[PDB]
Amino acid sequence: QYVAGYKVLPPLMDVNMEAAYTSSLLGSIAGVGWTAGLSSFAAIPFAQSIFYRLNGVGITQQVLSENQKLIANKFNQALGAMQTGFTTTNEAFQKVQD
Amino acid sequence: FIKTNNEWSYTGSSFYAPEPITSLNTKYVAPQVTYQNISTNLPP
Amino acid sequence: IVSFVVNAPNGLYFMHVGYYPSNHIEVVSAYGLCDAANPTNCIAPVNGYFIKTNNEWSYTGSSFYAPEPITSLNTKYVAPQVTYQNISTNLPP
């Protein structure tokens, strides 16, 4: 960096600021989306959140009320599938490398 | 408004699960020619 | 809420008037009021929240704390859920 000589500026905020922003957004993602308008806050437990979100897209309440465990296991394996997925096959990882 | 082999029933839009119709999943709309007629088993 | 459009010496200049909340408080609400004697007849609030408050439940909106007793005008009939809070002592109409 100095052999030719050029500065590399650090980013505008320290890593803890990004950590705080992501933590706040992850803590609010369960609560913002329950009612139109962002004045109120609805920090529901995440189970009832995903129940209502999956109900609103064309699922009757009966099947979600009787089959919490199977959809929960499906959610768990779906989230765990991408832990080992970081390879060349990931488009977003390739864009990060690019 | 699914037909059953188990006489209509209700199903949603993203999972196959027939279940009996109520007032909780329909709306009263003015008639059209293409709507089916029934006079045997009245829905609730 | 509203917006306005005016010209600019090389473009378009925009006013936007929007809602800005403040003095936020914390209250205790439920998810659905349903009769214990009739487990089918359960209702849910529309664009608001069923609220427990003091001078029994009431209705509140979604952008301002305006307590008001519930009617059919701000609720809809929804199928029973086990997580809905029950009531058996003072049934709203």
Ligand SMILES: *[C@@H]1O[C@H](CO)[C@@H](O[C@@H]2O[C@H](CO)[C@@H](O)[C@H](O)[C@H]2NC(C)=O)[C@H](O)[C@H]1NC(C)=O
């Ligand atoms: C159910 O019966 C009604 C009563 O006849 C039918 O409705 C009319 O059908 C005639 C026949 O073509 C039309 O000219 C009218 O315009 C219809 N009126 C209305 C209000 O829809 C209806 O088509 C029948 N539905 C069936 C057989 O599925």
Ligand SMILES: *[C@@H]1O[C@H](CO)[C@@H](O[C@@H]2O[C@H](CO)[C@@H](O)[C@H](O)[C@H]2NC(C)=O)[C@H](O)[C@H]1NC(C)=O
């Ligand atoms: C309100 O009362 C109803 C009926 O008594 C309760 O619903 C049942 O609760 C039991 C025990 O929790 C469950 O085993 C049943 O499966 C529930 N029935 C249905 C149709 O879900 C309900 O839990 C009560 N709610 C509260 C907050 O007390």
